[PDB]
């Protein structure tokens, strides 16, 4: 699950730029044509305040950062592992609601002792 989260963050945690070239039902654009467009929109040479001037038939789309609750997956993983190894959940740098105080806390720390 840890490996899966890491790979998922790389693919889905960050937005990616999608430049679409040509008119819809228009002239076809070939690979060599896209090499010149790639040179204009290269994220390597782009800076924060670059501005783009185009004709109507160039579209700068975004692949958004797609939401997933990797934090909750980490919490579940840490809960499964800590409860299996007999440690309290707090040892995994994970907090949980209502369990941090009162007789709930007394019981879990008593079980550990």
């Amino acid at each position: 699950n840890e490996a899966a989260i890491n790979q998922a963050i790389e693919l889905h945690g960050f937005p990616q730029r999608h430049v679409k070239v040509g008119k819809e039902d228009g002239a076809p654009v070939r690979d060599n044509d896209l090499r010149r467009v790639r040179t204009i929109f290269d994220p390597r040479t782009t800076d924060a305040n670059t501005a783009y001037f185009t004709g109507q038939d160039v579209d700068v789309e975004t692949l958004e950062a797609h939401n997933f609750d990797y934090s909750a997956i980490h919490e579940m993983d840490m809960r499964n592992l800590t409860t299996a190894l007999g440690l309290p959940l707090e040892a995994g740098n994970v907090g949980a609601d209502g369990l941090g105080s009162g007789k709930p806390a007394e019981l879990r720390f008593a079980l550990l002792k």
């Binding site: 008119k23 228009g26 044509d33 305040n49 001037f53 004709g55 038939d57 160039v58």
Partner: peptide, 15 residues
């Protein structure tokens, strides 16, 4: 028209 991108606006520039 086929020789000349079918009159489509494929131009792009950067700052």
């Amino acid at each position: 028209l086929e020789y000349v991108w079918e009159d489509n606006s494929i131009a792009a520039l950067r700052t």
